[PDB]
Ligand binder design. Structure first.
Ligand SMILES: *[C@@H]1O[C@H](CO)[C@@H](O[C@@H]2O[C@H](CO)[C@@H](O)[C@H](O)[C@H]2NC(C)=O)[C@H](O)[C@H]1NC(C)=O
Ligand SMILES: OC[C@H]1O[C@@H](O[C@H]2[C@H](O)[C@@H](O)[C@H](O)O[C@@H]2CO)[C@H](O)[C@@H](O)[C@H]1O
Ligand SMILES: *[C@@H]1O[C@H](CO)[C@@H](O)[C@H](O)[C@H]1NC(C)=O
Lengths: 247, 261
């Protein structure tokens, strides 16, 4: 399984992990005019998950199950206990972490369900190596006080970074600066719109690369930028892969 | 689902020096020419795109006026394109007549400049951003060894330095004509070599040329489509202080680049 130990967590290593994660998610990906891979769809439940291993400062590891169809966590294993989201595919139970004591968490893998249950937003949740490591611990022992916050951190640093080079580069800056950051509007707007941008960018085939509706992607100065076409470098040299939407 | 097949969309078109595609004085009549003009909210800079492969302002379709190079691009009756295949727009923003292969070109950079159908040489003056946001995108450009590009030697040269947040000369303004310009002095552009003996990439006054057109590709490269080559770090060594134009190769990571805005 693809791994990222905090004991070996440089800018170079992080980038290599994220790069490989993209590669594995984009196996059998379809391609449009934009040249940005589209994730697989109608994948049989037996082949639908990609396993990823995250190790903390104690050499203790969690194995996360990433749905290849949408690059979200369906579940994770820790020693011999596994934990599933409610909205995880119903038959996932019978396919992954089969030889463990399975639990169902009382919420969905969406940021909205996590922020509701956790009682805190992404805007007030710092990110960084120190927090990356802390989240693996808290998921390994499964202290339910911290479980929601730990997913905010890890979804953003692994999956949303895989989705967006901007987010990948936010984490890289943090690694080399040795300094934490809370996500800004730029980051959050990319997380918010990944689903919508996937639709508009695939519908854009119809109108020579022009969107059906504009998408506001904020910059680092908190100025919105309307993206209503495939001809924006902040979309094209940023979004690594996209959700299947249109045939 | 009928959200995958959107029936139309109205938006602006920006290009050379960030000026917009504009029908001269909002004139209705067939053959009324189209020009560069400073961008605004007026009805004659609004371009509505359709599955008909048409691009419409003032209820009338954008079109080339001749099979030869050098003639104006105009607006005319959409009934006259009854069995025409219309416009095609490449990934890089080259707007092309499907039949003649002529491409939307701005032979100068000033206001009221006539736009014409010319042969595609992949120049900066033949590159266009379809979209309402016409502004330059101010950004840093990160490359090999997590370093930022920086304008150096009085905005004449360019190479990699370590990313300092405040630093002025590490910021680049990305224009609608595919040009990468110095943020503090937007008359200047990132340019490939004018000298045949060098492959060195340098900073020069903008001139609508092939040397200054740059595409940020989804596969992570910075491409110059005219010269069929990409930005590369010299010998994959950032301390040589030389960025060069090279054929695309996965040998090394000097041809991999990120936009951070
Ligand atoms: C693209 O250009 C082609 C040729 O330049 C155009 O097709 C011709 O249109 C003229 C009117 O100017 C007709 O009388 C000719 O019969 C057509 N000739 C050919 C070669 O088909 C077409 O109008 C242009 N289309 C657009 C949308 O620009
Ligand atoms: O000069 C190009 C500019 O024209 C404006 O329209 C003017 C036009 O120039 C003038 O001849 C007419 O008498 O009055 C019009 C309205 O002010 C357009 O507003 C502009 O978009 C350009 O096309
Ligand atoms: C979880 O997802 C389901 C649909 O899969 C939805 O009906 C439900 O409202 C979501 N949230 C919670 C807290 O169950």
């Amino acid at each position: 399984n693809l791994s990222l130990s905090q004991s070996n967590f440089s800018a170079d290593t992080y980038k290599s992990f994220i790069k490989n994660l993209r590669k594995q998610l984009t196996i059998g990906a379809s391609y449009g005019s934009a040249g940005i891979p589209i994730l697989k769809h109608s994948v049989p439940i037996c082949e639908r998950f990609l396993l990823v291993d995250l190790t903390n400062g104690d050499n203790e590891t969690i194995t996360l199950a990433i749905n290849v169809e949408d690059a979200g966590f369906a579940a994770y294993r820790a020693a011999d206990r596994s934990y599933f989201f409610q909205n995880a595919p119903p038959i996932a139970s019978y396919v992954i972490f089969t030889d463990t004591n399975q639990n169902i968490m009382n919420f969905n893998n969406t940021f909205e369900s996590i922020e509701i249950v956790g009682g805190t937003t992404r805007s007030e949740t710092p990110l960084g190596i120190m927090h990356f490591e802390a989240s693996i611990f808290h998921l390994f022992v499964h202290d339910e006080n911290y479980v929601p916050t730990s997913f905010l951190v890890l979804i953003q640093m692994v999956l949303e970074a895989a989705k967006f080079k901007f987010i990948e580069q936010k984490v890289i800056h943090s690694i080399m600066d040795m300094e934490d950051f809370t996500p800004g509007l730029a980051m959050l707007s990319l997380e918010e719109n990944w689903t919508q941008l996937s639709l508009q960018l695939q519908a854009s085939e119809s109108l020579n690369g022009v969107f059906g509706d504009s998408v506001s992607l904020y910059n680092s100065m908190d100025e919105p930028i309307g993206v209503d076409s495939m001809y924006y470098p902040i979309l094209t040299a940023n979004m690594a892969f996209q959700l299947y939407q249109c045939p | 689902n009928e959200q995958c097949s959107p029936q139309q969309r109205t938006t602006r078109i920006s290009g050379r020096d960030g000026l917009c595609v504009d029908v001269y004085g909002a004139l209705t009549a067939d053959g009324s020419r189209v020009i560069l003009y400073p961008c605004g909210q007026q009805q004659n800079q609004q371009w509505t795109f359709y599955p008909d492969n048409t691009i419409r302002s003032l209820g009338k379709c954008l079109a080339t006026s001749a099979l030869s190079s050098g003639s104006n691009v105009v607006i005319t009756n959409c009934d006259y394109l009854r069995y025409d295949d219309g416009w095609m727009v490449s990934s890089s923003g080259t707007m092309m007549n499907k039949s003649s292969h002529l491409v939307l070109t701005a032979n100068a950079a000033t206001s009221r400049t006539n736009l014409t159908g010319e042969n595609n040489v992949f120049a900066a003056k033949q590159a266009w951003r379809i979209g309402n946001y016409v502004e330059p995108i101010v950004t840093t450009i990160i490359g090999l060894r997590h370093m930022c590009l920086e304008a150096t030697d009085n905005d004449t040269n360019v190479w990699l330095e370590s990313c300092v947040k405040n630093k002025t000369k590490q910021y680049w303004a990305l224009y609608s004509d595919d040009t990468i310009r110095v943020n503090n002095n937007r008359n200047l552009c990132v340019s490939s070599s004018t000298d045949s003996s060098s492959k060195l990439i340098v900073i020069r006054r903008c001139d609508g040329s092939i040397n200054q057109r740059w595409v940020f590709t989804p596969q992570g490269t910075i491409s110059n489509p005219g010269y069929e080559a990409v930005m590369d770090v010299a010998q994959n060594d950032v301390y040589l202080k030389k960025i060069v134009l090279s054929s695309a190769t996965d040998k090394g990571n000097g041809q991999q680049w990120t936009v951070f805005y």
